[PDB]
């Protein structure tokens, strides 16, 4: 019949946060499958999800901006944000579904693939060591094992790794994160603790990396515009792939980045052609980057191509599950404008349990797989064995 | 202690949508109300709250921009919609409680009053006859029954109606609502037969109001740039108070005020400063409505006060039970550009049971009362007499 | 009652200027207090007051906003300046007497606090040493006692400190101060002059500061955009937290910024978000600076909203006495986006008489009271003490 | 010497506020005057006046521009408004005296003259026999009124009169004034009733008139963009010289202009080029009101100069008594592109009692006078034998 029967979610636990699961099945038997995320910022997805395919059952699984330009009717006042996340979620479901029915990699539906290999970025470095330490581990607690981490990516042949900000001399080694209340000063004034212990940090970083590997700098929501120019012009003289800033103010982002002697990066949040345009009419960004987890991967086509006719490459925002990974790395696979993709390296102990399949990498790049649908499904066995705690995330 | 001692969400019937509710109480024993909605394109809402609601236990019930600037952080990168509607919802109980623990009514908190009465009109009229006429009698089934229902509002001396778009000559009495896809045509385009309607339908609307009573059209998302422009064009002779028209195109929307010989409202759908901000740098609006239930009502006097500097009068959005009535018209009282309120003047049979006090009206004005708090309270007992339903609004 | 009885205005020496207040009396013997100013520019304020009350008495103590409607339409044509700090005086008396009213600080009235102390810096340092060496002591005469003030800066744990423009090698130590005719050189050309003397000096503050301690420098109207230019291209290599500049022109101020190396501080003589709007939309300052003695807390609150949608961070604009500070503590404790607020270190002999409670800093931070209002009020029998003497400030 | 020996400041009564003059004397005894006013919503000016004329005592009286310059040095910080008002007077008294010294008229310090005679219009026509019928009579209390006054301009051979916004059936006929608070609705909102009076006045006023003489209508501050454009719809088919429009919205202003079937005049409360400028900028006149009284006449050929370039003709700002218009006459004799002069015929029983020399009206024109300095002098005798009530105008 090629219809819908069931959409249903699924959670297990991911140490500090939990994955999510949508599981959509068909009449034929085949079974669709996206990963989505509470934690960051986004209590309610579920629900979302759990009243919109109420709508979804007994249409067709083929139909998928059908259900796209329905979903976007019933939820228009309140578009975006948790809302936009539970589309996205179903629209990653029904890729998967369609993308099996017809018995190919999810790239096929995407324009067919251009590369066969992506070139990554270690995102988290050390960033998941330093703070979530009880789940990846060797733990850093000090600049030596900053400079370690950085030489451990070095040794195995990454290219790039991204790191965030964190304070060394006041105290245990901790992150700084005012943008997400960790601490709460809600001014976000960047300090000269700040600079100090940024210049430390990223000193001690490049001395593991050595000359050749690029580092990435995330400063997320953590300052506003006017300290954005204060980091940036300390600095200045540092070797930086990107600077990733957050913002909310297309002018204010276009501001700091006409004044920035490094490319910036922004948009990880944002959702559409629509969210992503002020931006872009405003030169606020060398880089976007796109979550397609949160808006879909049809969508996120949309936005490459838009991104593309402003001659701006993209890098998918990626830092979850494995699943996550899969589905990024078909978009990555049919998107000419890419500028790299994102991952985390670290893994927890039993990420390899929770899918059928593991990204491979080899010689700093991902290796796109070509198996019907996204490359990977969640094992509904190993998620019950790793039942879901409360939430965590930003909300811990 | 003046410590938050519990927050709590509650539902009830009201027949083709649920009411909804957080409780808020201290240690002092007061206990603070808000209504909020989600059958309004906002399934989440609740999870929301439920998620935010475990930090806010064992802070000060005083410090409502606190929490505010906090929740702001921890949902940072999914804010606005479903997400900014909860952290609204726990603002208007943090209000209730902190006014009650003062004794005053909630527009002291506000500035103080600055008019005792405010001016409404009389909404969904005569939608909620014609489109749930199970729940507002008496039902409207044809032109005659909308001349009848503006020559009760005239008669019961209310200054202003507002309806929507309704199709007369193809079967029975219908709304047209395409941007809630109701029905299913997701290019929204504007045809001879809707123009025509809404010919008919304004005609014996305005046969019953009289040439005193002033009407207002409600459009919604039901078109694009394109469709509206082709609207105002054929009611360019009608007397209309206001045509509202939600848009998230500030380009595109300011582009039809420029050629509408009718004042343009918008924005109900629209959080904080930051989203009103487009619109009104674009000369997009001549009234700026302002969802205070959503917003929360703090932050609503933020985007009055910028609406002010740029001459622009704001409207409350409301259209629910009567809590966030009396929640609007705090806000209405202490706002000095105030437009009109709205108000839905056709009630349920069991409205009244489940509040312990009635807005009350005279001469076309709403009273604003003097109580401690928003000015009613959800009854508990009443609550649990009328058990919800799933979601109905736009997702029914 | 809750009528406002009286409005009466008071005045006492403060060495080269005076001190005003505004008293306001309720039916229950409640007294509500403002400061203000007319020495910054402003003669005038006590008329503009003396009128405005009048049509005060009989009025409600709470309806504070209502009496700003009010005042705003009866002085409309004549708006901002002179007659909007004569409206902020009041307001910032109505605010005092109705939080006293309802027992408690004025900070809970304005969303209530959100930090219980803020980071100062100690303004007028060393320039009140310099300019008026017989009320603030220890006389500074050269650079060796700019030095020396600095080192007590960072002696007594203030974590910055803000000087002005100096003249050390022609003649007498003196203030370079064209902006306000001293001396009158209407053209504010710089020369080499006071290119070397700017040099001169902050490099003895800073060498006496050390490098931690953080400097401003405020250029107040000192120049025209060319010579700020210059300035700030002498002053590329200086560590400036910022650099306060301010202009009537947008356009200007905007190029000075996109020229500048260092964070730039503007408006501290601007009314109302239709005043610092023109500056926002140009991308002018880094940090707005408020003056909520001239606005009015409850408007500041305003701008300080309109700024956060901006990205902005505020800092108040704080240099009177005792009754200013706490008024801008209030504010300061309630504003998410505050930058830092300003504080004269440097007191009157008799300062302390003048008011029941002195200002408390502990490590470089102003401990926010929690009394009922703004937490100190006049003393009426030490005002009677330092008669005023004739208008001094700018006036000298 | 040349020197300023005093500047001294004199009141009077003028029915329903008080005229206010500048009294200048030099070392040679030659006396220097100006008209000033605080009833226009401005307390404070003689305050102003009285400090900054202490100043100028010892200086020439030839250095007017220096004046300016150094007053505007000291008052920087609070300029505009009622600061700037004082330094108007004050230079308006100099620029007679120096006119005086030197045996010509003001308009041979201001280019020279380039017309004899000035078209005006009665201006406040029927407005002071409406609103200060114990003034100005005979009293207009109906719409008969109302023509009448309009048939005596047409006999009186003037070409064109201007009125304001009047309630003619709801009780005895009012002003509708609430941007001046008469009545106190802040909101500004225009309804059906404000509508249907000016229809019914505007459209008596035109059968008074006859078809050649003009009519101009002024709105003031009275409502907001939205109302502008309600009211200009509604009165599209009259024919108007102008209609009168004031703003502080630059964008609002403009928008409304585009889409005025009539020429829009403005800024009457404006200061300086720097205030004009974002009006013109956006288009968003067709005639620029210069208050010369409130500027300065030396400082508004500097406003008429800019005005001139942007191919925008002026009109004076002149409704205070004949030393006023003989102020105005002199600007009005200099600059080119001169739009109209504005005058109030209808005069005082005592107004000729205060003044040397009327204003001499022929054929609907202003005689410019050649007597040394102004055209007339306050007779200090006569201001004596009529004291000065408390402030009136605006603040009544
Ligand atoms: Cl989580
Ligand atoms: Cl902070
Ligand atoms: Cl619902
Ligand atoms: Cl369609
Ligand atoms: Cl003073
Ligand atoms: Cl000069
Ligand atoms: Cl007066
Ligand atoms: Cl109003
Ligand atoms: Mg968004
Ligand atoms: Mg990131
Ligand atoms: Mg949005
Ligand atoms: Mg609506
Ligand atoms: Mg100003
Ligand atoms: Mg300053
Ligand atoms: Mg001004
Ligand atoms: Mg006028």
């Given at each position: 019949?090629?219809?819908?029967?069931?959409?249903?979610?699924?959670?297990?636990?991911?140490?500090?946060?939990?994955?999510?699961?949508?599981?959509?099945?068909?009449?034929?038997?085949?079974?669709?499958?996206?990963?989505?995320?509470?934690?960051?910022?986004?209590?309610?997805?579920?629900?979302?999800?759990?009243?919109?395919?109420?709508?979804?059952?007994?249409?067709?699984?083929?139909?998928?901006?059908?259900?796209?330009?329905?979903?976007?009717?019933?939820?228009?006042?309140?578009?975006?944000?948790?809302?936009?996340?539970?589309?996205?979620?179903?629209?990653?479901?029904?890729?998967?579904?369609?993308?099996?029915?017809?018995?190919?990699?999810?790239?096929?539906?995407?324009?067919?693939?251009?590369?066969?290999?992506?070139?990554?970025?270690?995102?988290?470095?050390?960033?998941?060591?330093?703070?979530?330490?009880?789940?990846?581990?060797?733990?850093?607690?000090?600049?030596?094992?900053?400079?370690?981490?950085?030489?451990?990516?070095?040794?195995?042949?990454?290219?790039?790794?991204?790191?965030?900000?964190?304070?060394?001399?006041?105290?245990?080694?901790?992150?700084?994160?005012?943008?997400?209340?960790?601490?709460?000063?809600?001014?976000?004034?960047?300090?000269?603790?700040?600079?100090?212990?940024?210049?430390?940090?990223?000193?001690?970083?490049?001395?593991?990396?050595?000359?050749?590997?690029?580092?990435?700098?995330?400063?997320?929501?953590?300052?506003?515009?006017?300290?954005?120019?204060?980091?940036?012009?300390?600095?200045?003289?540092?070797?930086?792939?990107?600077?990733?800033?957050?913002?909310?103010?297309?002018?204010?982002?276009?501001?700091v980045r006409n004044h920035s002697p490094?490319?910036?990066?922004?948009?990880?949040?944002?959702?559409?052609?629509?969210?992503?345009?002020?931006?872009?009419?405003?030169?606020?960004?060398?880089?976007?980057?796109?979550?397609?987890?949160?808006?879909?991967?049809?969508?996120?086509?949309?936005?490459?191509?838009?991104?593309?006719?402003?001659?701006?490459?993209?890098?998918?925002?990626?830092?979850?599950?494995?699943?996550?990974?899969?589905?990024?790395?078909?978009?990555?696979?049919?998107?000419?404008?890419?500028?790299?993709?994102?991952?985390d390296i670290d893994r927890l102990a039993?990420?390899?349990?929770?899918?059928?399949?593991?990204?491979?990498?080899?010689?700093?790049?991902?290796?796109?797989?070509?198996?019907?649908?996204?490359?990977?499904?969640?094992?509904?066995?190993?998620?019950?064995?790793?039942?879901?705690?409360?939430?965590?995330?930003?909300?811990?």
């Amino acid at each position: 019949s090629l219809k819908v029967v069931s959409v249903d979610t699924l959670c297990c636990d991911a140490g500090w946060r939990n994955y999510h699961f949508v599981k959509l099945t068909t009449d034929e038997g085949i079974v669709g499958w996206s990963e989505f995320d509470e934690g960051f910022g986004s209590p309610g997805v579920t629900a979302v999800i759990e009243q919109l395919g109420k709508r979804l059952v007994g249409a067709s699984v083929m139909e998928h901006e059908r259900f796209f330009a329905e979903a976007y009717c019933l939820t228009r006042p309140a578009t975006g944000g948790v809302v936009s996340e539970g589309i996205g979620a179903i629209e990653n479901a029904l890729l998967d579904a369609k993308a099996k029915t017809l018995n190919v990699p999810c790239y096929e539906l995407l324009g067919g693939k251009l590369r066969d290999r992506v070139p990554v970025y270690w995102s988290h470095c050390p960033t998941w060591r330093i703070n979530h330490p009880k789940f990846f581990g060797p733990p850093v607690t000090d600049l030596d094992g900053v400079k370690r981490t950085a030489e451990e990516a070095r040794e195995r042949q990454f290219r790039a790794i991204k790191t965030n900000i964190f304070i060394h001399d006041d105290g245990p080694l901790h992150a700084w994160r005012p943008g997400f209340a960790v601490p709460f000063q809600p001014a976000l004034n960047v300090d000269r603790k700040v600079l100090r212990n940024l210049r430390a940090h990223l000193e001690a970083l490049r001395d593991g990396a050595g000359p050749d590997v690029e580092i990435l700098l995330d400063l997320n929501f953590n300052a506003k515009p006017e300290g954005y120019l204060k980091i940036l012009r300390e600095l200045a003289d540092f070797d930086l792939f990107w600077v990733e800033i957050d913002s909310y103010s297309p002018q204010g982002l276009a501001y700091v980045r006409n004044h920035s002697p490094h490319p910036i990066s922004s948009c990880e949040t944002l959702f559409g052609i629509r969210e992503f345009k002020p931006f872009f009419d405003a030169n606020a960004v060398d880089v976007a980057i796109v979550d397609t987890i949160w808006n879909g991967v049809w969508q996120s086509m949309k936005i490459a191509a838009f991104a593309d006719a402003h001659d701006i490459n993209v890098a998918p925002h990626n830092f979850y599950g494995h699943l996550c990974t899969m589905i990024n790395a078909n978009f990555a696979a049919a998107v000419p404008n890419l500028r790299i993709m994102e991952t985390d390296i670290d893994r927890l102990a039993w990420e390899d349990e929770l899918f059928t399949h593991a990204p491979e990498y080899q010689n700093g790049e991902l290796i796109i797989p070509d198996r019907p649908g996204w490359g990977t499904d969640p094992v509904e066995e190993a998620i019950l064995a790793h039942p879901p705690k409360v939430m965590g995330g930003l909300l811990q």
